[PDB]
Design a protein around this ligand. Structure first.
Ligand code: FBP
Ligand code: FBP
Ligand code: FBP
Ligand code: MG
Ligand code: MG
Lengths: 518, 518, 518
């Protein structure tokens, strides 16, 4: 009568749905990664401490706005908040830092010399688009300046332009030398420095701008865990980010953000070149028709699950929580369905960066994820992952699917994995066990990067290397036993799966043990 | 390449997801029924004409507010708009009328003049919780009193009272090892006349209030097609609505709204007694934890699909469209997932009743539904429905499963069903074909009520009765051919499935024909 | 294009059949146990050496015929032949001895004083059955003596009497006391001391006769590995055999032979009480209609597979090989299908006991088994075994299933299992891996008894117990590596699965390692 175990036993997906039970409580463990955008609502050390307690795993830094100095301070505050819990290694939670690039963005300028001024646009009205820098800070109801000098080369008569998250829509009725005559289709309030989308158009802006270069270099300096690369259209875009990160940033994970039609069409080559994917639904839902976004989301999650690569579901997941302490029913549904789709990580943007309820948003993601994780039809999911995964000679892959199989068979409270680089734990995660994967590492970057994968609950061991290797291994296993008991994942007498290797070093995971919790 | 046919052919659900394609266009046909709440934004004949054109199948009248005179005028306008298209029988769309009851409620507020003296709160104040009808109608600082009597017997200390339907949370504590105490907590504001809830309880209130009685009788007078019965807790509640509708309203469909923990717990008995179910997520999401609503939604949709009974997914599906001309990404997701879950109908409330963009909301539900319908994994869905449906001697059930099988085998443009009561078309809908079900009927109520079922595209035959019954049957088949050709569901030479019976009258459907479009 | 790996990957059983390929050669390893009845054709040390080389695993002694002296000599010769290979422990094959009881048989007397003398019986002719021992030696064309005293009390008028594996049929025409008068329906060559079947009748003979007692006692003295108990009707029959074997024979395996209606009806209780089952098709096909035998065979194999208990398919598998050096196509089919059904063991009776081609019969069973083992649809088989096997907390179960899963993932050349009692190896066999299970034991009886399980290739470790337990464990693993390499199951660099425990003694298997062959 716990964790949807009645639904778990169903012979059909339909019967599985019929058995979902609001009176069947989830396990304590939450498997889905929580990524939070840090901004003025969430930047203080004190707020960041509560974020972490509420379930934040990754701190996203959005490089659309702010200076390096601002970002360096945020990173410092994230690290201050994280390390305030280092005193108890059993309770310490690793926290990753993600750099989200600006990328090839298009923005308007200032309404009447102000950052906050708005004008109204009425349905049918003429609005002139200018690239004359004179009108940079002088936008209004009749004249709009935007920052893309090549707009006129790529737009035509009858093109649609979207302003402010696609809320304002324009139709190019007349095209000039370095200006556009448009008609307001969908009107509304136009404010300053709003995002512009050209869904029809082949936009000519660089994959990695000069600003993106400086930002990525800063990320290397700041020891960031991962890059969320905005507007990835093709594999060569990924390779440009990778080259910029260089040898010095070779271990930083590249997550390609898919937010245009091109990114979708060339998904396979992008996935192959990336460490994972973000379904960047914001821009994606402006670039392609809104009614198609769920198709692209489920296609990308599916392909990532098949590749064993991390996938993030991002944007407007709990949007109304910017202003309200409770989400709408669509938002509750969206979070649950991203989990059920297969997403490794769910994300908050404005909900944590600037909203009135950042901690409530985090808490809500935690609550929903855990409910949805119990509602997964693992019986079908594990059968299909097995059938679709290549037979290989890799001992670690064999140990991992065997451990996952074993975890289903004895209903284990956890899979404990010792890992240096994270790979052994990643290989377990790919097979989607119900039980949490406690990944024990001494590598602090490994501990942080592990949040990219569903189910991986990283624990940073800070006990010194014990001389007898077998004792050092047992120490780390016992550490995980202590964490799992303290977090209420399991109790003494329960069975857990333990994954180790036959010698120290990396690349030797080959041992699976079914052990009672002491 | 069309209607996700590549995804359709996948051997696994995971590969099916991998194959979902934003460049695979849907068919013209949309199967999911659209229910729109009518109010000041959508009440005019002229707006209602556009609502119908945009895809409105059912007009919901919410009896929480408004007089019978107001409602009678709305119903008149709906009928005026609908009948403006009666001139072309080929293109005429039937439009149903649904009466949504107030049901047993509570009504918060004493100070109520357009903009009330705010709830806001007051994390411990004097309002105050009373075991009496004494100090109710009194205010001296900031208080707002309700309309319900006996709270006790079915009560426990420290419970919650969600004012303005979940916009405000409450702390209310009585017993309480010290006197007969009260308490107040976290607030916001108030519009005018709110509500109170009592979680996990068995609430005693009448199923059918005196007001409900008058509105149900009004519904019979106004020839409504269906009743959405509010706050159904048990089968005897449904039987009370049924008795109130009486012999005169015996053909009016009763849709039980599942609104609370009891309604979820007693779901099976409610379902058996009802004509269908509404997943009333608004109240449900206040009554149970918000993070559990997706569980109850998927449980009820699944059980309804299993029973072959209509299920409506309701509340906040495109909520942000009240103020904005585009939905959020969570809202697009929610609509698509309700359809993928298997909902027969999707609903709009404030989006069409009071919002700034009613037609855009309707259109968006139409676009999403049709995209999601192509993304259904029919291969698994039809296998599971067959495996789980009882073998019976019923010739109609066997014919209707034969018709769906045949429709999958020849990739038919439609399933044409002659039906008097709708039952034969309902029986086809239960098996979830990809192709639209063109239900040809002379019964105008049948034509309207058929919108409750996924894929039933009702057509009201006006043509006079031909002399030879076989010729009158062929006339109605040809009528459906003409509708399908006009709507672009199919062209001359395409194959369709045709269902008829061996003699006139209801209950004799036993003939399935695979026929070319003339 | 080996081991039917193309057929292995099919999404359906039908496609799997379509992909079966005569040009796809099997591995080396043969999993199905081969049981050979030893008799005059096969009992010389020299022939027995070749039977072992040809693949004989179990030596069956049929106690319907022959003296203790004769059987003691056979057993001595089996042991002489087996031990001639003891010189190389790497190549030594353990060989089990099985005692097959006479049980409650009914046999005829001697034809005209001789045990080889044969009357040809006429169709339609009269034959008198007597219990008068005057005629017990004087059996002829018109007088046949049976050894069943209670014949007349259990066989009514009109009853069918079958003689000589059912080939001769007689109808009870005249029912008396001490005798019966019958007409030969199916005439033929009647010989001496032929089996009699009374399919209608409730035969009241003891489960364990006085001869059976002398025989089982002899089995205990002779250190037999297993008893094939004839004509088991009920669980109390198994308990009887178990009590007869007593403390002294407590480790001898009881295999209940199912060969009448009652034993099929009471199958579940029999199975629960036994160590395994023989499908004793000979008698079964006379006792129940011949056309039902395949139903009872597939039912019993299925239930045994589900229980993880050994099942033997027995009787007439290659019958024509008694006289011919090649089998019929029905016989090739029968062998292949018993393996495909999921039989742990196949058996030879007259083919090895008295036939002209015993080594050819053994060889043929080995060739067909190995071809059929490759044709198994493991994808469905392993999925179904998993779904149907209880979730338990048993660490060994979890390890055994983990092992089989891992073995499928890395296409391992073997699963190596250290076992004292055999149980850990039995637990792996239950889940049906494609790869052989090399069971390393120091227990010689364990090594012999392990032939009862599909895929278990037992190896008897002779090496002395090392002082360091970890070194003793590694020594046994290495021994299995050497066996596998020598038998061509795998080569250096290939991967294998290794199962061990955390401490010495039975019941602690919890460790699964994926190890390269040194
Ligand atoms: O996942 P990775 O990076 O391959 O690391 C797993 C490694 O961790 C271990 O369990 C322990 O290694 P250390 O003692 O070096 O920390 C190895 O046996 C194994 O090869
Ligand atoms: O779906 P229902 O109400 O059972 O109606 C189906 C009936 O319609 C028919 O096809 C036509 O009947 P009518 O000619 O009386 O309309 C019958 O043969 C069949 O029994
Ligand atoms: O199959 P069984 O009878 O439980 O034996 C398996 C046992 O063999 C071992 O691997 C080795 O035990 P021994 O050293 O006592 O032979 C144990 O760790 C394990 O419990
Ligand atoms: Mg973006
Ligand atoms: Mg027999």
């Amino acid at each position: 009568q716990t964790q949807q175990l009645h639904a778990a036993m169903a012979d059909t997906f339909l019967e599985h749905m019929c058995r979902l039970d609001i009176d069947s409580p989830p396990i304590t463990a939450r498997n889905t990664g929580i990524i939070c955008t840090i901004g003025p609502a969430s930047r203080s050390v004190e707020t960041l401490k509560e974020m972490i307690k509420s379930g934040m795993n990754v701190a996203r830094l959005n490089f659309s706005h702010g200076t390096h100095e601002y970002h360096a301070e945020t990173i410092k505050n994230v690290r201050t908040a994280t390390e305030s819990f280092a005193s108890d290694p059993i309770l310490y939670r690793p926290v990753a830092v993600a750099l989200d690039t600006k990328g090839p963005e298009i923005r308007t300028g200032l309404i009447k010399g102000s950052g906050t001024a708005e004008v109204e646009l009425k349905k049918g009205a003429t609005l002139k688009i200018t690239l004359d820098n004179a009108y940079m800070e002088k936008c209004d109801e009749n004249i709009l300046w935007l920052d893309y000098k090549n707009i006129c080369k790529v737009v035509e008569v009858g093109s649609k332009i979207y302003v402010d998250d696609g809320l304002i829509s324009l139709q190019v009725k007349q095209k000039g030398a370095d200006f556009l005559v448009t008609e307001v289709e969908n009107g509304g309030s136009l404010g300053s420095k709003k995002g512009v989308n050209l869904p029809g158009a082949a936009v000519d802006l660089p994959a990695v701008s000069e600003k993106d270069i400086q930002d990525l270099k800063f990320g290397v300096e700041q020891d960031v865990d991962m890059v969320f690369a905005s507007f990835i259209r093709k594999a060569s875009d990924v390779h440009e980010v990778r080259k910029v990160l260089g040898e010095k940033g070779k271990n930083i994970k590249i997550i390609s953000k898919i937010e245009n039609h091109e990114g979708v069409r060339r998904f396979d080559e992008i996935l192959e070149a990336s460490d994972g994917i973000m379904v960047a639904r914001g821009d994606l839902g402006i670039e392609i028709p809104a009614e198609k976004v769920f198709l692209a989301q489920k296609m990308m999650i599916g392909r990532c699950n098949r590749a064993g690569k991390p996938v993030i579901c991002a944007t407007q997941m709990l949007e109304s929580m910017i202003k309200k302490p409770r989400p709408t029913r669509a938002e509750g549904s969206d979070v649950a369905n991203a989990v059920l789709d297969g997403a490794d990580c769910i994300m908050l943007s404005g909900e944590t960066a600037k909203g009135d309820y950042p901690l409530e948003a985090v808490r809500m993601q935690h609550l929903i994820a855990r409910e949805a994780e119990a509602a997964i039809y693992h019986l079908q999911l594990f059968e299909e992952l097995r059938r679709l995964a290549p037979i290989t000679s890799d001992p670690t892959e064999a140990t991992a699917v065997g451990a996952v199989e074993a975890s289903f068979k004895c209903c284990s409270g956890a899979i404990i994995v010792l890992t240096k680089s994270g790979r052994s734990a990643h290989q377990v995660a790919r097979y989607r066990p119900r039980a949490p994967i406690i990944a024990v590492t001494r590598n602090p970057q490994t501990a942080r990067q592990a949040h990219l994968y569903r189910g991986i609950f990283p624990v940073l061991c800070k006990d010194p290397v014990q001389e007898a290797w077998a004792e050092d291994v047992d120490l780390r296993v016992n550490f995980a036993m202590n964490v799992g008991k303290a977090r209420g994942f399991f109790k003494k007498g329960d069975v857990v799966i333990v994954l180790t290797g036959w010698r120290p070093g990396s690349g030797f995971t080959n041992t699976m043990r079914v052990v009672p919790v002491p």
